[PDB]
Amino acid sequence: AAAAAAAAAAAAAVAVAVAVAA
Amino acid sequence: VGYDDIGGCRKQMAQIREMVELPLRHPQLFKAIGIKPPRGVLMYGPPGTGKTLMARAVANETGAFFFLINGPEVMSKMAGESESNLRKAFEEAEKNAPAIIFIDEIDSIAPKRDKTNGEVERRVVSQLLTLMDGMKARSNVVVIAATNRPNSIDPALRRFGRFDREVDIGIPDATGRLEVLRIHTKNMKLADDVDLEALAAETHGYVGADIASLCSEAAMQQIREKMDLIDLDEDEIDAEVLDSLGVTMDNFRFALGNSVNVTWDDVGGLDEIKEELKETVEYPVLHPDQYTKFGLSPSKGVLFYGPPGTGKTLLAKAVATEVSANFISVKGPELLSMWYGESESNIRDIFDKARAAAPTVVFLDELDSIAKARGGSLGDAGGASDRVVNQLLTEMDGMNAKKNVFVIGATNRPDQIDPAILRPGRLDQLIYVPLPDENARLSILNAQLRKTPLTAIAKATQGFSGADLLYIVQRAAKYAIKDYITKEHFAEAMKTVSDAELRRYEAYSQQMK
Amino acid sequence: CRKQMAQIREMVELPLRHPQLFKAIGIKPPRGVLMYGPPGTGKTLMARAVANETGAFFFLINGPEVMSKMAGESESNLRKAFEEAEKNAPAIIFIDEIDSIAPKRDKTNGEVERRVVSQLLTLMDGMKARSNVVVIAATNRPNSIDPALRRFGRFDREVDIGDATGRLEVLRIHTKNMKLADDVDLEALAAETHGYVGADIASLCSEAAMQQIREKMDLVLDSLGVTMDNFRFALGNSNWDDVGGLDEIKEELKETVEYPVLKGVLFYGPTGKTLLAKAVATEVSANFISVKGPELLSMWYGESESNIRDIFDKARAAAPTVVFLDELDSIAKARGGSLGDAGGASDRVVNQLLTEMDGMNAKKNVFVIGATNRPDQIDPAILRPGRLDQLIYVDENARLSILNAQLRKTPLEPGLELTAIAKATQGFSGADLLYIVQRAAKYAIKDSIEAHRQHEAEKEVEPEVDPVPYITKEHFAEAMKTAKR
Amino acid sequence: NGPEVMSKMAGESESNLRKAFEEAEKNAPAIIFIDEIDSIAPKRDKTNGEVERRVVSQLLTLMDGMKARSNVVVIAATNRPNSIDPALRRFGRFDREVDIGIPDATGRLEVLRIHTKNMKLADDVDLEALAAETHGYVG
Ligand SMILES: Nc1ncnc2c1ncn2[C@@H]1O[C@H](COP(=O)(O)OP(=O)(O)O)[C@@H](O)[C@H]1O
Ligand SMILES: Nc1ncnc2c1ncn2[C@@H]1O[C@H](COP(=O)(O)OP(=O)(O)O)[C@@H](O)[C@H]1O
C-alpha cells in the first residue's frame, strides 16, 4: 500500500528600510 | 585544459601550481619539514579572467578530481535542502581521490550573517564553516572559491584553514594580453599582414575572456565575407576553397568595432602643450626603466583652464589614445547626489575602477563645480561640497599606492578652487590653453578637413573658438548633403566668446606667472 | 522573413553540410540557435521546413515533455536524446517551448527542475567537434531565459522572427481533404488573413464546416459543401492622411526622415503635435517608442540616468527607432540653478538626457522627436546645434479634416455641415474638437434616454429602434455653448 | 467524481481509470463525464508527489488513445480553469472550451420562470421587475 506525507518548509518576506537625505 | 592555455597570470599560476603540486608530488618533503600546507584558495577579481579555466587546468595537469559547484544552483528556497546538497557534494568529493572542489560565485552564499534577514543563507554559511573546519575537518582535499567582491564574505570564512590564502587575479597587462591573444589565435590559421603586437596594444581595456569572443567574431566575419558568392557546400565540397584562408587586419578591426579613436592628428595647434603632455604621459609607461634607475616617481596631475570649447577634452582624449591606457571622463555635476554619503561613494568607486586598470587617464571636467573652495558656506550644500572636496583630496593623494593614474582637470574658473587641489603632487601642472592664432586656424582647418572633398577664412575668424569652426564645417557638410565641397557653401556660411571672460583669463594667467 | 530565412539556412548548411570547411577555418563556435519573437510568426513552420529540407535526424523535444516523476528521469532522458542525436548522424535537435525547462535556477524553488536545467547545460556544453550536431530552440518570450544558457558556447545566435504565401499554402493543405465548394478562392482568404498562424486557419476551416452543417440542417450526405460565404462569415466572426493641413510641413518632415535613413527634431506651437507624432509612428515604416514628459524619471532608484538610460539602451538595441519625447519642457525645464532636492533631481535628469542623447553617432540611426507648447522653459543646452537643432513651428482646413475624421464611425445627422464649426473655431485644437464632439454625444445620449423613458412610461400607462438615431444640429449647437479654447 | 479515482492498494488508481474507460468503450459509443478535473489535473508547478504524476499520465494516455470506432466523448467541468495541467489543452485531448458565463436580464427572467413554475404564486407576482434588480445573481 502507498502513503502520503506532509511538508511545510518556509516562505519569503519583504522588509522596509529608512534612508537619510542630505 | 592545460597550463599552456594560461596567459598573463604568471605569478598566480606559479603560486597555485606550487600549492597544489608540492603536497601531491612529494608529500615526503612535507613530512620531512613536518607541517601541512593550506588547503584553501579565494580568487577575487572581475568576471571572465581565467578563474575557472585556471582551476580546471590545475585539476587536469595534476591527476585529481574536479567538482564544480554553482552558487545560486545549490541554493534552495525549501528548508533543509541547501546544506544537504553541500554535505553530499563534500562527501562524494571526499570519496574520490585527492580532489579540487570549486565554488563559483561564493559571495552569493556568504552574506556575512550580519545584514542578512533570511535564515537559509546563514544556515548554509554555518554548514560551510563546519565542513571546511571542524572535528575531522578534511582529509587530502583542496577547496577553491571564486568571487568578484571578497569583502562581502563572512569573516569566519577568510580565516586560516578555511581559506588560508587569497590570490588576486586582476585585468592582465599588455604582455599578458598579448600572450592570451596568441594562445587563442594559435589554433586559428592566421593570414599574413596581421601583427599581434598592434592588436594587443589597441585592445587596452579588455578583460581577457572576451578576447576569445573577439577572435571568434573575426573568424565568423571572414567566413561570412567569403560565402555570399561561394556555395555553402550544398552539393559537394571543393578543394580550391580550403586553401587561402586566414584572418586579416580588416576582420579584426571590424570585430573590435562590434574608448575613442584619436591619433594626435585631428588636434590642431597647441604645439608646445602637446609636446609637454606627450612628454609627461609617455615616459612613465614607454620607458619606465629610466625612472626606476633614477629612483623617482613621475608627475601625474595636470590642469587646464581657459575659455570653453577650446579642445581641452579633445586634447585629453588624444593623449589617452596616444598611449595604450584607458580613459574615464566624468563631468562635475554628473556625480553629485541629493543623498548623504552618495557623492563620496561615487568618487571612491570611480577612483577604485581607475586604479584597478592601470595605466589610466582620469579626466575631471568642470572641476570648479566639484572641487569648490571649502572656505565658508554654512549650509547643507556647503557640508556636501566640503565632504566631496575632502574625498577628492584623500583619493588623489592619501594612504594609497598611486601605482599609475594620471588625473587631468579642465576648468573654466581657476579662482574658485581651493589651494589644496592645486598643491604639487595632486595637480602640479597648471597649463593655460589659449585661443588659436592665425597659424593655429590654418592648422585647425587642415586637421578638421582630412576626410573631406583656407587662409581667407582663417583670417576671417578674429578670436573664435574651435567649436565655432566645427559648427561652420558641419553646416557646410549639411548643405553639401542637401545639394565636392563648393566655395559658395563657405561664402554663405561665413555670415552665420565675451571679452570679459578673456580679461579674467588673462588676469589669472598673468597673476599666476 | 527573407533575411532571417537566409541566415538560418546558412547556419544550418555551413555547420551541417561542410564540416570539413568549418574545421579548416579553425572556428567551431556555431552549436546553438535560438528563435524569439512575437507569437504566430512561423518559428514552428521554420523548424518544420528545416527538418523537411534536410535528410538528417530530427529529434524534437518539447519543453514540458521531459518531466516524468521518476528519480532523475529528465536528465537521463535528455542525455539519451543527445546521445541518439550524436550517434545517428550530424543532425539538429529542435527544442520547442524552451520557457518550461529553464526556470533560471534562482526564482524557482523545485528540485527536479533545478537538476534538469543543469543537465541541459552540461549536455549542450559537452558537444565536441566530432559530434557535428546542432541545436535549434524556439521560445515565446525573450526575457524568461537563463543567462547561463545564452552564454558563449551554448546559445549565442539568436534570431528575431518578426506571410500571405505561407498562409495560402497552409489553407490549401488544410482544406485539400474536404469537399469545400466550386466557387471558392483561397487567395482572398490568404490575403485577408494577417495574424493567423498554424492553428487559426484550422479553426477557421472548422468553423466554416460547422456553419455549413448548421446551414443544411434547419432546412443529404453527398450534398454538402462549405461555400465561400461560410468561410467569409467564419473569418468575420473570428480573430499620413489623418493629419489635415500642414501639407508642406509634413512633406518636408517625411523627406528629411527618409533622407537621413537612406539627429532629432522638436515641435513647438499652440495644434496636433501628438497627432503628427502618431502619424509618423504609424506611417513611417520604422519602429516607434513614445514616453511621457515626467514619465521617464518615475522609475525611482536614480531614475534620472536609470529609466532614461534603459530607454536609450532599448532604443539603440532596436535600431532604427523613433523616440517620441512628449512634454520636453516638463522634463528639461531649463534646470539652471534651483538649490534643492527637486533641483538636484532635475539636474540629474538633464545630465542623463545629455549623456544619453549626445552619445548617438551615425551608427544606430537614432532619432529623438520632442514636442512642446511653450518653448521658453526648454533648456538651451538641449536646443544647441549638433544635438537637436530642428524647430518645427505648428487651421480651418485642418480643423475641418479633424472634425471629419473624428466623426467617421459616428451616426451623424445627414442635414449637418462641419464647415460652420471649422470657420467659427479659429484658435482651437483637436482636443477641443474632441471635447465638443463628446459633449454633443452626451447631449444626444441624454435625449435618447429621455425619449426611451417617455416611451416606457407611455407603454406602462411604439417608436423606432432609436428616437434620435443621428445627432442633429441642435445637439452640436448645445455642446458648443460650453466649449472653450 | 474527480477526487474519487484513488484507491487503497498500491497502484490501483491507474487500474480504476483503465477499467472505467474499458467499460465506457465496450458497451456503446457512450459519453463519460469527469467532474472537477482540476482535482486530478494540476499544473506541474503545483505537483510534488508521485502518484499524482502517475494518475495524470494514465489519464493523458487514455485520452489520447481514441480509435475511430470508439465514438465516445469526454465532458469536463471545472470552475478553476487557470490551474489545469496545460498538457490536457493540446489538440486531440481537450480543444473545445465552453465559457458558461453569467446570464443577462433575459436569462435571469428565464431562470426565474423555470424555478417558479412549481409553486403557488400570488397574483401580484411580477417576475419582470425581479429580473432587473437581481443584478449580480447567477443561476
Ligand atoms: N589567461 C587566459 N588565457 C586563456 N583564456 C583565458 C584567459 N583568461 C580568460 N580566458 C578565457 O576567459 C573565458 C571565460 O573565463 P573563465 O575563467 O572561464 O570564467 P570566469 O572568470 O568568468 O568565471 C574562457 O573562454 C577562457 O578561455
Ligand atoms: N585643436 C583642436 N583640434 C581639433 N578640434 C578642436 C581643436 N580645438 C577645438 N576643437 C573643436 O572645438 C571644440 C572644442 O571643445 P572641446 O573639445 O569640447 O573642449 P572644452 O572642454 O574646452 O569645451 C570641439 O568641437 C573640438 O572638436
Side-chain angles (χ1 to χ4, degrees), chain A, chain B residues 1-9 12 14-17 19-24 26-35 37-61 63-69 71-80 82-94 96-113 116-118 120-132 134-135 137-147 150-153 155-163 165-185 187-188 191 195-196 198-201 203-216 218-219 222-223 226 229-230 239 241-250 252 254-273 276-281 283-286 288-296 298-321 323 325-328 330-333 335-336 339-352 354-368 370-371 373-401 403-437 439-445 447 449-450 453-454 456 458 460 463-464 466-467 469-474 476-477 479-481 486 489 491-493 496-497 500 505 507-508, chain C residues 6 15 19 24 26 29-30 32 37-40 42 47 49 51 55-56 63-64 71-72 81 85 89-91 102-103 110 126 129 137-138 142 147-148 153 162 164 166 181 188 190-191 195 198-199 202 208-209 225 234 236 244-245 260 264 269-270 272 277 279 281 286 293-294 298 302 315 317-320 332 334 336-337 340 342-345 359 362 370-371 375 380-381 385-386 398 405 411 414-415 420 422 424 427 430-431 440-441 444 451 457 463 467 469 477 479 483, chain D residues 2-6 8-11 13-17 19-21 24-25 27-44 47-51 53 55-62 64-66 68 70 72-82 84 86-89 92-94 96-103 105-116 118-119 121-123 125 127-132 134-139:
Chain A
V14 179
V16 172
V18 183
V20 184
Chain B
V1 66
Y3 286 159
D4 55 59
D5 295 331
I6 301 297
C9 307
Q12 310 95 330
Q15 163 158 352
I16 289 168
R17 165 55 166 166
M19 161 208 271
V20 165
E21 183 61 26
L22 268 293
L24 193 148
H26 298 267
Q28 66 276 19
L29 187 148
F30 276 51
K31 296 291 184 182
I33 197 167
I35 60 161
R39 339 314 313 275
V41 178
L42 177 82
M43 308 219 155
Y44 56 106
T49 315
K51 300 182 181 69
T52 61
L53 190 145
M54 175 143 46
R56 69 180 65 257
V58 175
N60 294 353
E61 186 61 26
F65 179 73
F66 183 74
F67 188 78
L68 181 290
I69 291 166
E73 189 274 331
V74 71
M75 179 96 165
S76 158
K77 184 50 227 67
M78 166 149 156
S82 298
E83 51 264 18
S84 70
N85 296 126
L86 274 61
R87 286 202 303 293
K88 65 180 74 174
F90 268 69
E91 184 62 26
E92 61 83 19
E94 180 64 29
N96 299 116
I100 300 95
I101 294 142
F102 183 90
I103 297 157
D104 194 321
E105 191 67 23
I106 175 146
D107 59 326
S108 83
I109 62 176
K112 198 182 285 186
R113 325 185 285 173
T116 188
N117 287 298
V120 176
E121 61 273 21
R122 64 183 69 189
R123 286 198 296 273
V124 298
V125 168
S126 309
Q127 182 58 258
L128 286 171
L129 267 47
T130 297
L131 285 156
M132 289 205 270
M135 286 200 62
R138 272 202 310 260
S139 296
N140 193 331
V141 188
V142 193
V143 64
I144 298 165
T147 186
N151 271 14
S152 64
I153 303 295
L157 271 176
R158 300 174 72 159
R159 157 183 89 74
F160 173 77
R162 284 188 231 280
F163 287 143
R165 257 175 291 184
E166 296 185 353
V167 188
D168 179 72
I169 289 160
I171 302 180
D173 59 356
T175 185
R177 193 164 64 252
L178 179 62
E179 286 182 355
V180 166
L181 187 61
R182 68 175 64 256
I183 280 176
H184 286 292
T185 59
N187 297 113
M188 168 180 343
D195 67 326
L196 278 296
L199 263 180
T203 185
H204 56 274
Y206 273 50
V207 315
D210 52 61
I211 301 299
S213 72
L214 187 147
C215 295
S216 300
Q222 187 179 4
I223 62 173
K226 292 174 72 175
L229 72 164
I230 298 99
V241 67
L242 190 148
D243 52 28
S244 71
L245 268 291
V247 188
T248 62
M249 287 293 324
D250 62 351
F252 280 121
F254 177 75
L256 180 62
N258 189 0
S259 57
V260 182
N261 236 350
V262 186
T263 318
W264 262 112
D265 58 355
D266 56 355
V267 67
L270 306 173
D271 283 21
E272 69 280 17
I273 291 166
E276 294 219 317
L277 246 186
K278 64 192 291 154
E279 203 78 359
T280 62
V281 71
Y283 296 164
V285 64
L286 269 290
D289 55 355
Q290 308 296 48
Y291 279 153
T292 190
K293 68 181 287 296
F294 275 123
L296 288 175
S299 176
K300 303 292 183 68
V302 182
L303 179 63
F304 318 104
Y305 77 99
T310 306
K312 302 172 188 177
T313 186
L314 182 61
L315 187 62
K317 291 180 186 292
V319 58
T321 54
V323 180
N326 315 337
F327 175 85
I328 295 93
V330 298
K331 280 74 174 175
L335 293 162
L336 278 70
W339 295 97
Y340 185 89
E342 194 70 2
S343 301
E344 299 85 62
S345 199
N346 295 357
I347 299 296
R348 293 204 302 292
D349 297 14
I350 179 164
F351 270 96
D352 293 331
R355 287 204 206 76
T360 292
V361 179
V362 173
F363 182 87
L364 307 184
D365 196 357
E366 294 292 328
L367 198 66
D368 53 348
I370 185 186
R374 290 176 291 177
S377 196
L378 72 164
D380 276 20
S385 69
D386 295 332
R387 287 191 296 275
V388 66
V389 168
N390 289 318
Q391 186 60 256
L392 281 176
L393 296 171
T394 63
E395 197 69 27
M396 270 179 335
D397 180 73
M399 275 287 344
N400 292 315
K403 56 195 289 184
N404 223 319
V405 177
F406 294 98
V407 177
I408 294 167
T411 184
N412 254 0
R413 287 289 89 182
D415 57 355
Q416 260 165 40
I417 300 165
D418 56 8
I421 295 288
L422 279 68
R423 156 169 92 72
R426 290 189 172 132
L427 292 182
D428 56 356
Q429 292 294 137
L430 308 183
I431 49 174
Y432 172 84
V433 191
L435 276 300
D437 201 75
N439 323 61
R441 266 81 67 88
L442 306 199
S443 57
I444 194 71
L445 271 298
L449 283 74
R450 289 183 294 108
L454 280 172
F464 292 166
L469 279 70
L470 184 63
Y471 176 76
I472 295 296
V473 164
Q474 63 78 38
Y479 285 12
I481 294 295
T486 61
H489 289 171
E492 62 85 27
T496 187
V497 166
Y505 290 131
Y508 196 93
Chain C
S298 71
Chain D
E4 293 181 351
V5 298
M6 296 45 179
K8 184 68 178 294
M9 184 57 205
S13 64
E14 292 83 2
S15 67
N16 287 319
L17 275 78
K19 68 184 288 295
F21 269 55
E25 193 275 330
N27 292 295
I31 182 163
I32 58 173
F33 164 68
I34 172 62
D35 192 1
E36 294 289 6
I37 46 75
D38 58 356
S39 67
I40 57 170
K43 62 177 74 174
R44 300 297 90 192
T47 58
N48 289 30
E50 62 276 16
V51 187
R53 275 76 173 275
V55 68
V56 166
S57 179
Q58 176 62 245
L59 184 294
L60 269 298
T61 194
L62 291 161
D64 269 20
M66 298 297 251
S70 314
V72 308
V73 68
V74 154
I75 304 308
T78 187
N79 59 5
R80 190 171 69 250
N82 297 115
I84 304 299
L88 278 297
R89 294 184 134 175
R93 310 156 182 294
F94 288 111
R96 273 78 175 299
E97 57 76 25
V98 181
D99 185 25
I100 305 173
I102 298 100
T106 60
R108 289 194 299 273
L109 180 61
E110 287 175 356
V111 173
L112 281 154
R113 188 176 296 107
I114 289 160
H115 273 303
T116 55
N118 298 110
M119 50 202 272
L121 295 173
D123 59 356
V125 300
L127 305 100
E128 293 84 2
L130 277 73
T134 58
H135 267 293
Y137 292 83
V138 310

